Design a protein around this ligand. Structure first.
Ligand SMILES: CC(C)CCC[C@@H](C)[C@H]1CC[C@H]2[C@H]3CC=C4C[C@@H](O)CC[C@]4(C)[C@@H]3CC[C@]12C
Ligand SMILES: CC(C)CCC[C@@H](C)[C@H]1CC[C@H]2[C@H]3CC=C4C[C@@H](O)CC[C@]4(C)[C@@H]3CC[C@]12C
Ligand SMILES: CC(C)CCC[C@@H](C)[C@H]1CC[C@H]2[C@H]3CC=C4C[C@@H](O)CC[C@]4(C)[C@@H]3CC[C@]12C
Ligand SMILES: CCCCCCCC/C=C\CCCCCCCC(=O)OC[C@@H](O)CO
Ligand SMILES: CCCCCCCC/C=C\CCCCCCCC(=O)OC[C@@H](O)CO
Ligand SMILES: CCCCCCCC/C=C\CCCCCCCC(=O)OC[C@H](O)CO
Ligand SMILES: CCCCCCCC/C=C\CCCCCCCC(=O)OC[C@H](O)CO
Ligand SMILES: Nc1nc(NCCc2ccc(O)cc2)nc2nc(-c3ccco3)nn12
Ligand SMILES: CCCCCCCC/C=C\CCCCCCCC(=O)O
Ligand SMILES: CCCCCCCC/C=C\CCCCCCCC(=O)O
Ligand SMILES: CCCCCCCC/C=C\CCCCCCCC(=O)O
Ligand SMILES: CCCCCCCC/C=C\CCCCCCCC(=O)O
Ligand SMILES: CCCCCCCC/C=C\CCCCCCCC(=O)O
Length: 388
C-alpha cells in the first residue's frame, strides 16, 4: 500500500488546476457581458448565472472536495454542509440551463410576444428564486435526511475524533437514497429529459417554419406559371386567389411593408380584370408581379431564411452546453446507482470515484470555450478584453 499522500497529491494538484481555469474563464464571461451592451439580454443573464455557479465551484466546491477527502474529524452537521454545497451549485446550473432552453423556445415559437413576455426585470426575479430553490434542494440532508444519527464510531475512534465528531466522508453522512431517488432521479434526470424535449420542439418549430417559407414562395411562382399559359378568366382567377392568400399568409420594417403592399395590390387588380373577363390583360397585369418578386419578396424570404438559421445556430450552441453538463455529471450519478442498487457488487474503486469527481468539476471549465468558438459577439469581446 503506497502512502496515501502521493495519490492524494495528484488528486489535489488536478483539483487546483481545474479551480484556476474555472474561475479565470468564467470571470471573462461575466466581464464580457458587463462591458458589451449587445450581450445584455435575458438569455445572457442566465449564462452569467451559471458562470457564477462555475466560479463558486472553483472558489468553494473544489476546496470543499479537497478537504472532505481527508476524512477529517468534524461535527456531523458541519460535515454535511461541506459535502452538500456542491449539490447547490449543480442544482442552480440545472435551472439556468432549463431557463435558457425555455427562453430560446419562446424566441422561436412566438417571436411576436417574446419581447413582451420576457423582460430583464422578471428574469432577475426568476434567477433569485432559482438560487433559493437550489439551496433548499441541495441542503435537504441538513433538514434531517442524513446519517448523522448512526455514526460509524469505530472509524471515528480510529481517527481519534472528539466526542460528537465523525470522520467526515461523503458516503458516510449523505444517504444514498437521497442521492439516487431525490437528487438524481427527481432533481437532475427529470429536468434533463425536460430540456431534451424543449430542444426537440425548438428544432421542429424551426424546420416547419422554414418549410412554410419555402412553400409560400413556391406557391407564389407556380401560380404565376399557371396564369401564364391559362385559358380563360376563371383559372387566372384561381391562380391569383391562391397567390393572395399565400401573400397574406407569408406576410405574417417599412420597405418590407411596401413590397407586400405592391404585391397584393398588383394581385388585387389583376383579379378584377379577370372577373370582368379580360383574360390576357389580366395575364399581362400578373407578370410584373415577377418584377416586384425579384425586387422585394425574395429579399424578404432570404433574410427571413437568414434569421431562422441564426436562431437554430444559437439554440444548438445552447444544447451543446446542456449536453456537456449531462456528459460530465452522469458518470458519478451512475456510480451512486450501482453503489445503492447492487449491494452484491464491489464498490467502484477509489481511483474511479476521484476520476468521476474530477470530471464533474471539469464542466466548470468548458463553457467559456463554447461561447468563444460558437458566438462571435462573445469571441470578439473576449479578444478585446484580452488585448487591452
Ligand atoms: C462567504 C464565504 C467566504 C464564507 C465561507 C464559510 C465556510 C468556509 C465556513 C462556513 C461554515 C464552516 C464550518 C461549519 C461547521 C464546521 C464543523 C467543525 O467541526 C469543522 C469546521 C466546519 C466543517 C466548517 C468549516 C468551514 C465553514 C464551512
Ligand atoms: C459517458 C457517460 C454518460 C457513461 C459513463 C459510463 C461509466 C460511468 C460506467 C461504465 C462502466 C460502469 C461500472 C462497471 C462495472 C463496475 C463494477 C461494480 O462493482 C461497481 C460499478 C462499476 C465500477 C462501474 C461503474 C461505472 C461505470 C464505469
Ligand atoms: C442515461 C440516461 C438517459 C438514463 C440513466 C439510466 C440509468 C438510471 C440506468 C442505466 C444503467 C442502469 C443499471 C445497470 C445495471 C445495474 C446492475 C443492477 O444490479 C442494479 C441496477 C444497475 C446498477 C443499474 C441501475 C441504473 C441504471 C444505471
Ligand atoms: C457570495 C456570492 C459570490 C458570487 C460570486 C460570483 C458572482 C459575480 C458575478 C455576478 C456579476 C454579474 C455581472 O456582473 O454581469 C451581469 C450584468 O452585466 C448584467 O447587466
Ligand atoms: C431515463 C429513464 C429512466 C430510467 C430509470 C430506470 C431505473 C430503474 C432501475 C432499478 C434498478 C433496480 O431496481 O435494482 C433491482 C435491485 O434493487 C434488486 O436486487
Ligand atoms: C450564493 C449566491 C451567489 C451568487 C448569486 C448568483 C449571482 C447571479 C448573478 C446574476 C446577475 C444577473 O443576471 O443580472 C440580472 C440583471 O440585473 C437583469 O437586468
Ligand atoms: C469570497 C472569496 C473568499 C474565499 C473563501 C475561501 C474558502 C475557504 C476554503 C476552504 C474551506 C475549508 C476549510 C475547512 C477546513 C477545516 C479543518 C478543520 O476544521 O480542522 C479541525 C480539526 O480536524 C479538529 O476539529
Ligand atoms: N458517492 C460520492 N462520493 C463522494 N466522495 C467519496 C468517494 C469515496 C467513496 C467511498 C470511499 O470508501 C471513500 C471515498 N463524493 C460524491 N459526490 C457525489 C455526487 C455529487 C453530485 C452527484 O453525485 N457522489 N459522491
Ligand atoms: C482530466 C484530468 C486527468 C487527470 C485525472 C486524475 C484524477 C485523479 C485520480 C487520482 C487517484 C487518487 C485517489 C485519491 C486518494 C485519496 O485522497 O484518498
Ligand atoms: C480565490 C480564493 C480561493 C480560496 C481557496 C483556498 C485554498 C485552500 C486549499 C485547500 C484546503 C484543504 C484543507 C485541508 C483539510 C484539513 C486537513 C485535515 O483536517 O486533516
Ligand atoms: C422553499 C423555500 C424555503 C426554503 C427554506 C425554508 C426553511 C428551512 C429552515 C430549516 C432550519 C434548519 C435547521 C435544520 C437543523 O439544523 O437541524
Ligand atoms: C440524459 C439526457 C441528456 C439531455 C441533455 C440535454 C441536451 C439536449 C441536446 C439536444
Ligand atoms: C479511462 C477511464 C476509465 C474508463 C472506464 C472504466 C471501466 C471500469 C473498470 C474498473 C472496474 C473496477 C473493478 O471492478 O474492480
Amino acid at each position: 500500500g503506497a502512502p496515501p499522500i502521493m495519490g492524494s497529491s495528484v488528486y489535489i494538484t488536478v483539483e487546483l488546476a481545474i479551480a484556476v481555469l474555472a474561475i479565470l474563464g468564467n470571470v471573462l464571461v461575466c466581464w464580457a457581458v458587463w462591458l458589451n451592451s449587445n450581450l445584455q439580454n435575458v438569455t445572457n443573464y442566465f449564462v452569467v448565472s451559471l458562470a457564477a455557479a462555475d466560479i463558486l465551484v472553483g472558489v468553494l466546491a473544489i476546496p470543499f472536495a479537497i478537504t472532505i477527502s481527508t476524512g477529517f474529524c468534524a461535527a456531523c452537521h458541519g460535515c454535511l454542509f461541506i459535502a452538500c454545497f456542491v449539490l447547490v451549485l449543480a442544482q442552480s446550473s440545472i435551472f439556468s440551463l432549463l431557463a435558457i432552453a425555455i427562453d430560446r423556445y419562446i424566441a422561436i415559437a412566438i417571436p411576436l410576444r417574446y419581447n413582451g413576455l420576457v423582460t430583464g426585470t422578471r428574469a432577475a426575479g426568476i434567477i433569485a428564486i432559482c438560487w433559493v430553490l437550489s439551496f433548499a434542494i441541495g441542503l435537504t440532508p441538513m433538514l434531517g435526511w442524513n446519517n448523522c444519527g448512526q455514526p460509524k464510531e469505530g472509524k471515528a475512534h480510529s481517527q481519534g475524533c472528539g466526542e460528537g465528531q465523525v470522520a467526515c466522508l461523503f458516503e458516510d453522512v449523505v444517504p444514498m437514497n437521497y442521492m439516487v431517488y431525490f437528487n438524481f432521479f427527481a432533481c437532475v434526470l427529470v429536468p434533463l429529459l425536460l430540456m431534451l424535449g424543449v430542444y426537440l420542439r425548438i428544432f421542429a418549430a424551426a424546420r416547419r417554419q422554414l418549410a412554410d417559407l419555402e412553400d409560400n414562395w413556391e406557391t407564389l411562382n407556380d401560380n404565376l406559371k399557371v396564369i401564364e399559359k391559362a385559358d380563360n378568366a376563371a383559372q387566372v382567377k384561381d391562380a391569383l386567389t391562391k397567390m393572395r392568400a399565400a401573400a397574406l399568409d407569408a406576410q405574417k420594417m417599412k420597405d418590407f411593408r411596401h413590397g407586400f403592399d405592391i404585391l397584393v395590390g398588383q394581385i388585387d387588380d389583376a383579379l378584377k380584370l379577370a372577373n370582368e373577363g379580360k383574360v390576357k390583360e389580366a395575364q399581362a397585369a400578373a407578370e410584373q408581379l415577377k418584377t416586384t418578386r425579384n425586387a422585394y419578396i425574395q429579399k424578404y424570404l432570404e433574410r427571413a431564411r437568414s434569421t431562422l438559421q441564426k436562431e437554430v445556430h444559437a439554440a444548438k450552441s445552447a444544447a451543446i452546453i446542456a449536453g456537456l453538463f449531462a456528459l460530465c455529471w452522469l458518470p458519478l450519478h451512475i456510480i451512486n446507482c450501482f453503489t445503492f442498487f447492487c449491494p452484491d457488487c464491489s464498490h467502484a474503486p477509489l481511483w474511479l470515484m476521484y476520476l468521476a469527481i474530477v470530471l464533474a468539476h471539469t464542466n466548470s471549465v468548458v463553457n467559456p470555450f463554447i461561447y468563444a468558438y460558437r458566438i462571435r459577439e462573445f469571441r470578439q469581446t473576449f479578444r478585446k478584453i484580452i488585448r487591452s
